[PDB]
Amino acid sequence: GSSGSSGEPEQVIRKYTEELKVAPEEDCIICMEKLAVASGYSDMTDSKALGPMVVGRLTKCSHAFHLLCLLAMYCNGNKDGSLQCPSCKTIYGEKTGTQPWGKMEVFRSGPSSG
Numbered sequence: 001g002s003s004g005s006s007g008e009p010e011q012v013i014r015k016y017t018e019e020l021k022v023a024p025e026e027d028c029i030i031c032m033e034k035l036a037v038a039s040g041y042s043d044m045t046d047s048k049a050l051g052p053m054v055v056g057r058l059t060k061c062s063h064a065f066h067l068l069c070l071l072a073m074y075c076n077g078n079k080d081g082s083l084q085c086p087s088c089k090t091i092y093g094e095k096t097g098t099q100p101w102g103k104m105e106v107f108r109s110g111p112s113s114g
C-alpha cells in the first residue's frame with residue numbers, strides 16, 4: 001500500500017527551504033524583486049499549496065527565496081526530486097556539495113546570475 005514514490009515538488013521545496021515567520025531583508029534574484037512584495041512568477045505559476053507572498057530560507061546556504069519562484073524554476077524542467085540555488089549554485093538533491101557531474105555542460109541553457 002504505497003504510491004507516489006517521490007511525491008510532489010511542492011513538498012521538496014519546503015524540505016530544502018524553511019518558511020520564515022516573516023520575509024527577511026534579502027532580494028530574490030530569480031524575479032529580481034523584493035521579498036516584501038509578491039513573487040514575479042505569481043502570474044505564470046498558479047499553485048494552490050504554495051504562494052507568491054510565502055517566503056522561506058534554505059537550510060544549506062541559508063539564502064532567502066520565494067518558495068514559489070523556486071517551484072517555478074524546478075518545474076520549468078529541473079524535476080528530478082532535487083533543488084539547486086540559483087545564487088550559490090548549491091544542490092540539495094543530486095549531490096549536496098560539489099558541483100553536478102563535476103563541471104555542468106551548458107550548450108543552450110546557461111543561467112547568468114552572480
Ligand SMILES: [Zn+2]
Nearest residue numbers: 028031066069
Ligand atoms: Zn522571487
Ligand SMILES: [Zn+2]
Nearest residue numbers: 061063085088
Ligand atoms: Zn544560495
